[PDB]
Each structure stands twice: as C-alpha cells, then as structure tokens.
Design a protein around this ligand. Structure first.
Ligand SMILES: CCCCCCCCCCCCCC(=O)O
Ligand SMILES: CCCCCCCCCCCCCC(=O)O
Ligand SMILES: CCCCCCCCCCCCCC(=O)O
Ligand SMILES: *C(=O)CCCCCCCCCCCCC
Ligand SMILES: *C(=O)CCCCCCCCCCCCC
Ligand SMILES: *C(=O)CCCCCCCCCCCCC
Ligand SMILES: [Cl-]
Ligand SMILES: [Cl-]
Ligand SMILES: [Zn+2]
Ligand SMILES: [Zn+2]
Lengths: 29, 21, 29, 21, 29, 21, 29, 21, 29, 21, 29, 21
C-alpha cells in the first residue's frame, strides 16, 4: 500500500521532532 | 500501532508524543 | 547543536526506508 | 550511537541496518 | 484528512524553495 | 486557499509563487 | 549561505507541524 | 528572526510556536 | 494527479539514498 | 517507468536500485 | 562527507520540483 | 557538478534547471 508507505515517512519525521532528546522506537508491526 | 492510529486520522503532536521513549 | 539535529532528521528518514517492517530505534546523543 | 557513527562519516545501507529492530 | 496533512507538508517545502529570500505566509484556513 | 488550489490539482512553481510575500 | 538554506528547510517543516491550522510565517534573514 | 534564533541553537516546540500565526 | 506528485518526491529521496555515489537519472516520462 | 512501477506498488530498496546509474 | 550528503538530499528534492516532467540527473562528486 | 556549484552557494531555480534533462 504505497500511501501507507508515504504516510509512515512523515510519521517518523514528526516523531523525530516531538520526541527530541527522548528518542523513540518506530514499530509499524 | 502508530500506523493504524495516525495514518487513518491526523495525530496531533500531543498524540504522537505517546510513541516517544 | 543544530547540525546534529539536521543530520538526525535525515538518519531517521534513512532508517525508515532501510528497516522496512522491522522498524527502528532512534536515540540521539 | 548512530549519531556518533553516521553523522561523522556517511554510513552505508548495511551500517544503517544495525539500528533496525 | 491525513492525505491533506501530507499534501500540506510538501506544499510548505515547495513554497520555501520558490519564495527564497521573499519569505511566505502559510495560511491553510 | 493554497490547500484547496494545490492539493486538488498540481501547482507548478509559477502557481506556488503567487503565495510568496 | 547554503547551511542556512538547509536549516530553514527543516524549520518550515517543523512550523507546519507545530502550528497546525494557524499556519505560520517564514521570513529568511 | 527564526533563522538567528533557531539555526544557532535548537528551538523547542514551544519556541517554534512563536512563529505561528 | 497530486498523489502522483507526492509519491515522486519520496521516490527521488529513496533513489538518492540507494544509489549513493552511483548517481541516478530520474525519468518520470 | 519508475512512477508506474513504484507508485502503484511499494518498491523495496533492491527494486529501486535498478534505477541507479 | 556528511554535510555534502545532507546538501545533496535537498538538491534532489529541488530538482524534482524544478524539472517537472523532464526529470533530472543527479551525480555526486 | 551540481554539488560543487550548489553546495558552496545557493543556486537559483534557474541555475538548478541546468541539471534537468
Ligand atoms: C493518506 C495516506 C494513506 C495511509 C494508509 C495507511 C493504512 C493504515 C492501516 C494499516 C495499518 C497497519 C498495516 C498492517 O499491515
Ligand atoms: C493526494 C493528497 C490529497 C490531499 C487532499 C487535500 C484536500 C484539499 C481540500 C481541503 C482544503 C481546505 C480544507 C479545509 O478544512
Ligand atoms: C499513494 C500515491 C498515489 C500515486 C499515484 C501515482 C500514479 C502512477 C501511475 C502514473 C505513471 C505515469 C504517469 C504518466 O502520466
Ligand atoms: C550536544 O549538544 C553535542 C554533543 C555532540 C556534538 C558533536 C560535535 C561534532 C563536530 C561538529 C563540528 C561542526 C562545526 C565546527
Ligand atoms: C547571508 O547570506 C548570511 C547571513 C547569516 C549568516 C550566518 C552565519 C552563521 C554561522 C555559520 C558558520 C558555519 C561554518 C563556519
Ligand atoms: C569527498 O568525500 C569530499 C569531496 C568534496 C568535499 C567538499 C568540502 C567542501 C567544504 C566543506 C567544509 C565544511 C566544514 C569545515
Ligand atoms: Cl540538512
Ligand atoms: Cl506523501
Ligand atoms: Zn509525503
Ligand atoms: Zn537536511
């Protein structure tokens, strides 16, 4: 599902910004 | 998970924050 | 350090693509 | 960490894979 | 509308490039 | 506004330029 | 100054996400 | 301006909010 | 087709990462 | 071309590599 | 050289938008 | 090349067009 792939790319950029020094795991599944 | 929550509806920065460490 | 912040933005984009369904972990310094 | 490894030199795709889960 | 959110992200990057030194307002609504 | 114009149809750089200062 | 240009590209992405429906203004130096 | 403030140090999300409309 | 425009933007970023020193042509048509 | 192949289905990095020089 | 790698990521994004249906060529140094 | 031209100074949109096909 390409639109899902594209959405995930923006998700990870947003987590990078929100989480800051905290870091994050990205766990799609 | 984050894709089901935030690719089906816009997540604000406050909702995204739940996924941080 | 802004340059580190800009580097990390590109690193998470790359991890998203490299790691696929495994996802990844990002922790800044 | 990834910042010290991959912001001081360009990491290959296989080096980046060390930060996958 | 997530696809609208994703489109706006690309819009702002394109305005950044086109407008250059002029700057811009981004006014979605 | 810019979203109604340029998310319903591709805006060229010349059309985007209308939104600059 | 290219490094300023790269910083600003990331700043507008961040403003887009932070500012939501308010939108934002970007003016370079 | 935002460049002088946020390209010389990392701005927090609340600092960035000063450039919202 | 805006979604096509958005997809292409991500395509080119992925080619940049995969191709590395090799470079690439982007030939949509 | 790359848009018909990789915007209709997800292309992995290995499939994208076909488009490199 | 990481800073060159970050610059090039922004250059290909810009070429994608500037060049339209012509596409573009990217070759690093 | 584009890196030497446009990573050492900001290239205008018309300078970038030299790298279109
Ligand atoms: C506008 C972008 C459309 C994004 C569609 C994303 C689909 C989300 C539902 C799938 C969630 C986990 C997938 C599994 O497999
Ligand atoms: C391929 C990306 C799809 C983008 C859909 C964007 C919707 C644009 C119409 C809404 C314009 C202002 C919204 C209000 O509220
Ligand atoms: C989720 C993103 C949707 C992307 C739709 C892309 C359409 C691809 C088919 C068109 C391929 C060449 C177009 C010509 O003209
Ligand atoms: C925490 O805020 C900083 C810790 C890591 C800093 C990395 C410094 C690396 C070299 C960058 C030099 C840039 C310009 C002289
Ligand atoms: C206009 O073109 C430039 C005005 C602002 C320039 C900012 C310089 C800030 C410090 C960057 C140093 C980078 C490497 C030594
Ligand atoms: C190959 O790996 C490098 C060839 C081109 C290198 C460009 C160096 C340009 C000036 C950047 C200086 C950055 C900080 C002092
Ligand atoms: Cl950068
Ligand atoms: Cl997208
Ligand atoms: Zn996108
Ligand atoms: Zn960058």
């Amino acid at each position: 599902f390409v639109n899902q792939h594209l959405c995930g790319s923006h998700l990870v950029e947003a987590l990078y910004l929100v989480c800051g020094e905290r870091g994050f795991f990205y766990t799609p599944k | 998970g984050i894709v089901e929550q935030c690719c089906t509806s816009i997540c604000s920065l406050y909702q995204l924050e739940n996924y941080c460490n």
